[PDB]
């Protein structure tokens, strides 16, 4: 009706005003500022460890805060916790639902989480007197598949689902403390800020949104991608984040300027991006692709600084340790590989 | 030398035990048949599940038939982008696609065209010719045979298929729509469409599913062996 059309025009006016503001703050592109800096060399990471034992496609991995223990989920109904230094299997958690799509490691190391097509985020207790891993809680309430989950602390976890919503959970009570709505498509990934005061989510509507955890509101919406955003990761400084999408481009967005900074794409790359991750200093942007290899990007110059080609199937997982010593890649060939440099 | 501490050796032994258990679980899961259930909203999926047997997630049902324990996965409650999770069921033995024979006349909430049979055909086209299911056979199930027989006495098939020039009897109409469903396949060389008209009896649909799964497994074994 008339009111609906007036509201649509008003919203278009806000969109135009926001675009004009972003253009106004756009004076010099980040490529020009870093045009004088010394380019990084040829990054030549090589496989240091191969983690075998999964019998199906690995869908998610997450490093522990000690940079030694990592967890992986591989859709064979198993959650394996690895000792990356020795390739020993610390734990093997059987999942009630074998359709797991994400996994998380608590910063304290006492819990792991997983979820998938069952629309349930299951919390597992690792430090039990019985010596086995038990399901501490089964968080239900999402109407779609679970895409990502990240622990804030031992009692708070934020999940993203295919019902176009993100939720913050109180693990002890089991209820949704806050619901984050506004995405018009499936939310595929989320990344927590270093201070855990904010988090970004990338959805299938080719947009990324910044949420305030306590207030439960969307602060900024970032556009620019042409397809679904499958990956997202915060810059180590916390003032920027990078997104990986199905249009074969990785993009860097800065919160303060509220716009795109630089696009990481190549003509020879036409497959989508499954995972992104930043280096310890944020100089290197690692991204996993569907062409079975991971490309290392100079985050300040959009130059491919190296290739991590060691997987026979799609690279679905990516993770750099807290100390930045190693990077782990998960893949659909049921293998995890730990990569490191040499000097 | 070993150059390992006592605790390191014990941890290695624990990892070996975990590896053995994982191998046993994988061997157990290898001797299982995984079927993906697909269809329309009211395409007889519930009747199919009851014939071979918290949240609106994936519904997994098990049933053993002649020492061939099956796993049927129902994803009809996933109201999200199919392309974002359809690749999870890449290695399923077969896809059980259920359509209702009585939907040729019925029209869903979208009154303007969008015949339920046409909607199911469009769904069948997307799944049969999907990128992930290029070698996955489809066990097509045609449900509600009796309702189709009763509805065909008055309502002609021309409403759903104006190009149809056959008789109004049940046999020719059923064969024609089965041919329409089968011709949507664009990979006749790789995958095979098994078709069975669902009977009011209970013990015959599972027999057809078992037969089709046996044929699919034999063909897969032959392909792995290299005979064809």
């Amino acid at each position, epitope marked *: 009706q008339s009111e609906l059309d007036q509201l649509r025009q008003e919203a278009e006016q806000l969109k135009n005003q926001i675009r004009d503001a972003r253009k106004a703050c756009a004076d010099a592109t980040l490529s020009q500022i870093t045009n004088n800096i010394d380019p990084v060399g040829r990054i030549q990471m090589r496989t240091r460890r191969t983690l075998r034992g999964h019998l199906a496609k690995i869908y998610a991995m997450h490093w522990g805060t000690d940079s030694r223990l990592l967890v992986s989920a591989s859709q064979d109904g198993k959650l394996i916790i690895w000792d990356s230094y020795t390739t020993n299997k610390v734990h093997a958690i059987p999942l009630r639902s074998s359709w797991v799509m994400t996994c998380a490691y608590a910063p304290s190391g006492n819990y792991v989480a997983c979820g998938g097509l069952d629309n349930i985020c299951s919390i597992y207790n690792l*430090k039990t*007197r019985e010596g086995n891993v038990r399901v501490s809680r089964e968080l239900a309430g999402h109407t779609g598949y679970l895409s990502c989950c990240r622990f804030l602390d031992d009692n708070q976890i934020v999940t993203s689902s295919g019902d176009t919503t993100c939720a913050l959970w109180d693990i002890e009570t089991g209820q949704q403390t806050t619901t984050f709505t506004g995405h018009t498509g499936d939310v595929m990934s989320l990344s927590l800020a270093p201070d855990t005061r904010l988090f970004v989510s990338g959805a299938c509507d080719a947009s990324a949104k910044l949420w305030d955890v306590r207030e439960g509101m969307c602060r900024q919406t970032f556009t620019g991608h042409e397809s679904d955003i499958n990956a997202i990761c915060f810059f180590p400084n916390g003032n920027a984040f990078a997104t990986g999408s199905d249009d074969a481009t990785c993009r860097l967005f800065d919160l303060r300027a509220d716009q795109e900074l630089m696009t990481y794409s190549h003509d020879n790359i036409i497959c989508g991006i499954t995972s992104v991750s930043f280096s310890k200093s944020g100089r290197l942007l690692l991204a996993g692709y569907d062409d079975f290899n991971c490309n290392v990007w100079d985050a300040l110059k959009a130059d491919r600084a190296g290739v991590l080609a060691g997987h026979d199937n799609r690279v679905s997982c990516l993770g750099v340790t807290d100390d930045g010593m190693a990077v782990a890649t998960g893949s659909w060939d049921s293998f995890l590989k730990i990569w490191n440099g040499s000097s | 030398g070993c150059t390992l501490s006592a605790e390191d050796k014990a941890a290695v032994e624990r990892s070996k035990m975990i590896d053995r258990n994982l191998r046993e679980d994988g061997e157990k899961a290898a001797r299982e048949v995984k079927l993906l259930l697909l269809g329309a909203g009211e395409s007889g999926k519930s009747t199919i599940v009851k014939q071979m047997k918290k949240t609106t997630g994936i519904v997994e049902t098990h049933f053993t038939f002649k020492d061939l324990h099956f796993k049927m996965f129902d994803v009809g409650a996933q109201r999200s982008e199919r392309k974002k999770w359809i690749h999870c069921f890449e290695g399923v033995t077969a896809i059980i696609f259920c359509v209702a024979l009585s939907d040729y006349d019925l029209v869903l909430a979208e009154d303007e065209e969008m015949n339920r049979m046409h909607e199911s055909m469009k769904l069948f086209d997307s799944i049969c010719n999907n990128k992930w299911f290029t070698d996955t056979s489809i066990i097509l199930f045609l449900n509600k045979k009796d309702l189709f027989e009763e509805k065909i006495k008055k309502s002609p098939l021309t409403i759903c298929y104006p190009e149809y020039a056959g008789s109004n009897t049940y046999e020719e109409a059923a064969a024609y729509i089965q041919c329409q469903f089968e011709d949507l396949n664009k990979r006749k060389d790789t995958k095979e469409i098994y078709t069975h008209f669902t009977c009011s009896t209970d013990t015959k649909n599972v027999q057809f599913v078992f037969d089709a799964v046996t044929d699919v497994i034999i063909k897969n074994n032959l392909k792995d062996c290299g005979l064809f």
Partner: single-chain antibody, 233 residues
Framework: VQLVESGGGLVQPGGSRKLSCSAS????????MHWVRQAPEKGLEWVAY????????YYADTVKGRFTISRDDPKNTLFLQMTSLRSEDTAMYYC??????????????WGQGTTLTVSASADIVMTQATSSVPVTPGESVSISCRSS???????????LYWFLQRPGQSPQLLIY???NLASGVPDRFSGSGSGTAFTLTISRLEAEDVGVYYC?????????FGAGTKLEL
């Protein structure tokens, strides 16, 4: 978690006896099991060890050949078949659970123990020079320990364990790997030492902490205990 041992009592020298321990409240199959004996008015002495899954079995030199350790995982029972019993076998036998992975806490739970009575070179030497320390509540007391060879390994771990045996009670774990506090232990306990001399510090000592403190190494499987330092109130 609960371990109950049975089968003790008076035995004739040169005879045989079958000790059994019943596990309850934890996954018995996932834990390695130890038998630790304690001669009357003496210190702890490791006897035998069976790995999780019975893959690995170790015996002390004084019991090798005569003692046999076995477990029945489906029924949650640990056995110790002792034959040719000597007068030196008179001791109280404990069953100790110990799980081994990265960051685990072995020797965390000890059974109540069953008493047995017989009516008649490369082993790391763990030295506790002090035997009895008079202590007063509210003060800080440090227990000293030493080893014949360095307990620090190339992987960075120092396999030294601290145990407390309250009077009329089974020993309990305080510190594992010389620095990590066992679960349920108050924060007033602390451990240090580099590779050969180790110290356990009890800051702001109170009651219920009196007893004998034992040091154990877990570098080589002929596990050796210290003589034990007694805290007398």
């Amino acid at each position: 978690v609960q371990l109950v041992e049975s089968g003790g009592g008076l035995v004739q020298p040169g005879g045989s006896r079958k000790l059994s321990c019943s596990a309850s409240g934890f996954a018995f199959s996932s834990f390695g099991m130890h038998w630790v004996r304690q001669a009357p008015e003496k210190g702890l002495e490791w006897v035998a060890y069976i790995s999780s899954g019975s893959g690995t079995i170790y015996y002390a030199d004084t019991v090798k050949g005569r003692f046999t350790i076995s477990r029945d995982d489906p029924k949650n029972t640990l056995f110790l078949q002792m034959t040719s019993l000597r007068s030196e076998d008179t001791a109280m036998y404990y069953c100790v659970r110990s799980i081994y992975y990265y960051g685990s806490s072995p020797f965390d739970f000890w059974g109540q123990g069953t008493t047995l009575t017989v009516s008649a070179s490369a082993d790391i030497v763990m030295t506790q020079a002090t035997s009895s320390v008079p202590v007063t509540p509210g003060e800080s007391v440090s227990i000293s320990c030493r080893s014949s060879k360095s307990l620090l390994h190339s992987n960075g771990n120092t396999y030294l364990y601290w145990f407390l045996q309250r009077p009329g009670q089974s020993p309990q774990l305080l510190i594992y790997r010389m620095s990590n506090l066992a679960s349920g232990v108050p924060d007033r306990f602390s451990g240090s030492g580099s590779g050969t001399a180790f110290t356990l510090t009890i800051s702001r000592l109170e009651a219920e902490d009196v007893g004998v403190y034992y040091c154990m190494q877990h570098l080589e499987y002929p596990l050796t205990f210290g003589a034990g330092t007694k805290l007398e109130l």
